[PDB]
Symmetry: D2
Amino acid sequence: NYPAEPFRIKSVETVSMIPRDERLKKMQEAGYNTFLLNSKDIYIDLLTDSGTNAMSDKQWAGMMMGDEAYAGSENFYHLERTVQELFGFKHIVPTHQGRGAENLLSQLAIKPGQYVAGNMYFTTTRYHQEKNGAVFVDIVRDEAHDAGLNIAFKGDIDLKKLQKLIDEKGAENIAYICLAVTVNLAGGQPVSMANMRAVRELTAAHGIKVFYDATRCVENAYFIKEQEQGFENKSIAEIVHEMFSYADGCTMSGKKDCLVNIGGFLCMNDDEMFSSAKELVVVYEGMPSYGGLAGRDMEAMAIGLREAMQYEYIEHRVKQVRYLGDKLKAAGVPIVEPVGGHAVFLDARRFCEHLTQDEFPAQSLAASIYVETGVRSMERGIISAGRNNVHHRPKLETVRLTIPRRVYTYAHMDVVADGIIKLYQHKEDIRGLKFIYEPKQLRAFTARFDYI
Amino acid sequence: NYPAEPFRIKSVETVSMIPRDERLKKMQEAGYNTFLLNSKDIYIDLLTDSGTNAMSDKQWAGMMMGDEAYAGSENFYHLERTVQELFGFKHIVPTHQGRGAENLLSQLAIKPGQYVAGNMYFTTTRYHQEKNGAVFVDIVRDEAHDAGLNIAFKGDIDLKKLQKLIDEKGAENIAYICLAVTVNLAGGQPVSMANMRAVRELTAAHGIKVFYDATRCVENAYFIKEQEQGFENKSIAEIVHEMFSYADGCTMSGKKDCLVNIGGFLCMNDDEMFSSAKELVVVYEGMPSYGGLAGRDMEAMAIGLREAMQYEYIEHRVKQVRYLGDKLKAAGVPIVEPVGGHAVFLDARRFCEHLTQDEFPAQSLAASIYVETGVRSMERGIISAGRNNVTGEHHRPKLETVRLTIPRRVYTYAHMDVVADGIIKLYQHKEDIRGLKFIYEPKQLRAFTARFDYI
Amino acid sequence: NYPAEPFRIKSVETVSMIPRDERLKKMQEAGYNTFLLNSKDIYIDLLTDSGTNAMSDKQWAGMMMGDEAYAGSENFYHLERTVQELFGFKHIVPTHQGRGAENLLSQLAIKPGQYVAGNMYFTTTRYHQEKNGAVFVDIVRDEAHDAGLNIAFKGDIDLKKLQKLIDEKGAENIAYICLAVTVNLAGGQPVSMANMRAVRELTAAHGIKVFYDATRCVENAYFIKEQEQGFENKSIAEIVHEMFSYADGCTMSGKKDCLVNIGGFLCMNDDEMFSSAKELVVVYEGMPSYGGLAGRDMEAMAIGLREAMQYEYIEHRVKQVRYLGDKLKAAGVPIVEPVGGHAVFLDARRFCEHLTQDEFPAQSLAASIYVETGVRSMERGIISAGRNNVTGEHHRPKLETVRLTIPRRVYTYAHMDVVADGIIKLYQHKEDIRGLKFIYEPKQLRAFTARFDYI
Amino acid sequence: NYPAEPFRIKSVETVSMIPRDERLKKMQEAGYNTFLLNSKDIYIDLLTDSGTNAMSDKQWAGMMMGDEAYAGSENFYHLERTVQELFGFKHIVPTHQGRGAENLLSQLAIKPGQYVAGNMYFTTTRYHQEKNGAVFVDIVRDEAHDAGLNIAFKGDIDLKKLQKLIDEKGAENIAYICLAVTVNLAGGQPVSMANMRAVRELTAAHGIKVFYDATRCVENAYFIKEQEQGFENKSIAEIVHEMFSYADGCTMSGKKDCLVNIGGFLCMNDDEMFSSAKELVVVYEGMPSYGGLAGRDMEAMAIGLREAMQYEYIEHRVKQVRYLGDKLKAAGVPIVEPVGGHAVFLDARRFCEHLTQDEFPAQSLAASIYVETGVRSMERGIISAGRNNVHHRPKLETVRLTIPRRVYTYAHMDVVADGIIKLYQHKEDIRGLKFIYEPKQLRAFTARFDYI
Ligand SMILES: CSCC/C(=N\C=C1\C(COP(=O)(O)O)=CNC(C)=C1O)C(=O)O
Ligand SMILES: CSCC/C(=N\C=C1\C(COP(=O)(O)O)=CNC(C)=C1O)C(=O)O
Ligand SMILES: [K+]
Ligand SMILES: [K+]
Ligand SMILES: [K+]
Ligand SMILES: [K+]
């Protein structure tokens, strides 16, 4: 139900236990924005599960055996062999993180004017696709956009929508299908193996390429083992390996399910695309033999990816997130359902019914959570889409409580839960927010605000 | 009560997570003796809180700055300055752990034939005292021997017993008073500050030295802050500093409250004894500048001792143990009370009423606990008590216990639940636990290598 | 001259030490291409000084204090405060290495059709300039193209060429001047402070921006202190700070002079460009608070950049390279002169006079050097020059060289002797070195994966 | 001849480059004593090769995999297996360093009044023997006491002296033979395999036990491979294994040839003695399963001992010491000959001919070396023996330049050599020294002095 941590604590990280009065002053000095908070001031930093993971003793042992050679590093050979064994792809190009691989793939597989369709989008992924002249098309099923709808495998691609795109646009105008596992924006929702089969069957009949966003593929593999009939007696590794058998390649942000603080890579089976990838990695990331990573980090990511295949680790990872979601739902706090693999998303619509989507209820809710609890959370509603004078209104207005892997305990989840439950009582005190500075691209990171 | 961990996990330690049928295999290969289990086969190892603590990122940063010089290491000066500031003693000699310091103190402050009195005893501490020709006297309060009596500060010394010792035996025949904080043998019970001041006041009137067994002095200081009236406004470091102001020195096992995996030291104020300590440390430990420790470990112990002063850390340490004891007590599991600062003791005599002590209920209960949960605990009953080497019979202690010793900053409340739920489930059918018989029994220290089989 | 290492060895890196007959096996399996050799088969790897440096104990202590937070990491603030103090620039954006910063700068400061002029070029630097629609102009002094001309500060910009560029092409059509310190393509030649002041003086009169390629700016600063009169009383940090006072920003590869294995950053003073830099770093690198780097690596780079300011360290770094070049020159081995701050370049055209450039003497000499010593070097001749993709013929550079690139704080003078003695012995029978022919040749970047066999 | 370091530098240690004027002030603030110097003030610290070694990346990887369990640690199993494989002994008890094992052995194998004979002595070793009621008898050959005599294998035990002890005292009154490899006090001189054979043959015929001081046994093994006929085609490991086949047990200070900064152990083949050892290790060192060592240090010592078997490592180790000795001898500086495996010993008699052995020329020479060179050295002449009113005059009056393993370079040796050569020109400026404080035992460490 809620298993204990399948590991011991080897080393602890020093945190600051500042009281509520000083936390309020830290939030005021930050203009009531979580993205502008200082790490030294935050008790529980649930901003993102990206690169915030706690490594293992075996990974740190590999950190001591960094082969920092420019070419022919043993660390690269270990990572390349590991990814080939576990993902089954023919070739791998290391990158410094996921958006590095996305830059490479979007320049290699996109013709200007073609379409790229996927199960929702991500900020960096959609940018590099549109940067390279592609038009994004959301082919996730409509249910994935309903926060409260609790159905399994919400990340599945609607085959009818995919068939409609091929009929109206033609397979020649479709660069590739971008299948993300899991689907971050929908709440960390998984994709079923049956859906990955069906997408592969339909795309191959039209010669359409399929590239995965493998960023949280191990979490996705756990949901298959838990909820998809027929996979209950299959290991996580067997599920991961079969998942990528239905893809032509993948981009991976190791900073997620590879249990590292930096790292990523690009996979493909096509020899010619791999040749062009090595040409492009040099000018952006580095040599194909390190790709913008130190040897020690290629070693840590190779070891981390193998550690993620342990059933007990990934079961505890997901169920710890589920514990936080279950305790909030039991108290009546509105959340995105079902709980995803990496985060609990607070529904800012129902949390702030009095506020409209112009008043930015999610950002002021996240800013209110830290002031009252000392926990940082990420606004993942409207400001991620931005400001539009010619706003780019999304249906999901959420506040993301993102859990780094192997960093926090259930008692930490209780502090998060108990503090948010108390904020839910007087949810009317949450004010509105408006832009005062707007980046032309990816605005939620550097945007400043003021109360309405 | 029961606060969250006042820290994040920086790195983790890999464990095997073997199933029950496999754990039974391992326990049988271990001769049903948890001492013979392999670390790689254990999920939660509660054998001891000594040397098993998890260090901090700042401690591991110190591990990269080891000044490994044979003399004059910067790490020694950091350790020296820290102990001087926090404990207030004038001189410090490092040792590789606590019994190394006890070896030195017993040779320096004990004349053959003298007495050493203190609030009960520890095995290594008492050995070095008796090894140097001293007779041990237990001057602890009588309430300390009532394992079920739930009162505060059971480790306090009975001032009347000390006064009676000074009357019946000459004060010139008393080497020193060994005040231990906390008192391990009573279950980890603390000593009040008022008791330390009264012992210092009575001994100073007769010119009698007082040295502390301070291995768990930080745990002791938290009990003073929590339960002793008048210290609610004083920080842990202020309490620690005042504690040692009533002593002429101490022996310290850093492996306990200094949050390290190795290390100790010896403190004193007398300049002449410090000169003799430096001549003797070379014989057994090393130079006064490292004393049997790598430079990096003096640095880690210096950093860890300062981290122990954080109220939130030590409150969580003590209350995590208390959470385990409280959950067991609430389900009817018999435990030694009150819960100490570092371990929960199961009353195996009560737990296994259907077994006699000759059938080793504590050893069998520990074997059962591992099979059902993957938790290693330590037998602290008839097996550890040994045999009378003259008559051949068992040493039969009044306490037939299983010790759940909690390393610092290693486990979570979820791990405490694994220990509790498995023990509580075992207790709900405790009549099924079988007695053990000797299959192999060594000459000495039989707890470490003896092997058993079910009767 | 030739000072001892201003540091001790804290830890070592294991090497295989395979014999010659084994090394020949490895070289043949590598297709006689040192780029295809395995690191585990190499005793002394002089392929590059990028990312191959040995860190300090203090840097590794920082590696234990990584604040891995996605935004607001303490490691970023340490890096930011350090670069601001030592370089004097107003704003800093971290990147995972140097070409990441070059990607940002070229997109921020180049309008399609403009010119970018600088003292020669580097491959990645020039690519991002031309990728963003710029035309590169070489305004270096003519003496820089004379590989045997032994004069000081061969990297200085020809002020007349810059003045002529401002006259023939509009100043509004010049994106910026890319002043590199040092100049890699000339062999690692430094730029004088008087030249940087004259470039800043001339450009500021026309409102033209100046950005530095500062990857080896610390090596450059030592040459100023050693050879430029008037700086003999100024510290390295004072020289570094004055250098960047003549620039509006810089791109930095920490993998070079910041003594790290990964990392870089982008600096500028303009607030508006810094705002656009923060919007763009998210696209390719990461947040302005980590920019494609783990927290621990921002900490290591912050510590390493400050350590680079120590005069004794950088004097030994440059003079260790100079020792290799001096020993080779004293035996008659032909090298590019003067020796640069980071590498010694063998003149393979002169070394292998009996071979034509179509027989790849630099590639063959590097293959021979590894077989005889276990030293990997880099071909920097016709193979690395590539093919003309329109005509199919080789790119034929005037420099047919083998590069002995020295990582910082990794090797000793004894290792330099291994390189020198083996090369000197090869030179004493240089007529025995055989030419190479293509066995496998890829489409692009043939230096990395091509395979050869003896003719 | 002088091979390069068979390794690369992975990490460097920060040193202080204080000029001569400030070094002189640091020596004055220390009363012209090297033992009282601060590590932060010293450029090249040649005080001892004990625990000052630089570990490898593989050892530091093991430092990250410390199994800190009180019993059953994987690190103990690795160390126990490694010592059994490489030394061939049946049982091993870890100790925190060598004198910990010496305390154990002397209490287990010495009856009060018995004799312990060996090839010279060491400070801590002889103490524990005499502490337990044994009378030490030096059975090294006379040549070992002549500093300038350059003969091979000076550490060999004189079989005639050993035969004389058995004839005059009887084998029943001889506790054991203590065979040290190498012989520290003689200058690091090796012992030949033929001598270890002959000692074993003669002792076994009388039932006399033989226990080795294995502290610098790998250096000893190299000398056998280099200079003893028949062993030139035998590996270091084969030589080490055969060496201990002629012994009943050993005490080992891992802080020397095991390439660690802390650690040691006790070996024996006798089951009964091993049982008593486990009884005694508990009260002094700790459990037989860690013996006063953290798990990570048992791991590092196990890995270090295996690394010492590499011929290239140990060849460079000894020849680097030899390089320092050769450069000093070529300039006319008087030294102990031949150069030992771990240190170069400056003959203070010939370096200070004007001073007598009451004026303590070695201590003032060592104090003068640091003031002029910034290098710390250890007085290893008279003050190690002490002050006698009822001095304990030894024949060797030496200043030890002790080289830690894998820490320094040839350029460091040149700085040491060039500075001592200049001090040798005006060797008359070296004054005398007299005691002002005298420890009752092991005095040279805490003794203070003043000029005569
Ligand atoms: C503040 S948003 C940027 C980092 C963030 N995810 C990063 C993702 C990337 C880019 O990966 P990198 O951050 O470049 O390693 C690609 N796909 C997917 C599904 C992701 O969730 C996250 O916090 O969720
Ligand atoms: C300042 S003297 C003490 C440390 C020192 N040798 C230590 C030795 C020990 C004791 O070993 P520990 O120091 O206790 O690990 C035994 N035998 C032998 C032959 C040794 O050279 C040395 O510096 O040479
Ligand atoms: K330990
Ligand atoms: K040491
Ligand atoms: K690198
Ligand atoms: K990170």
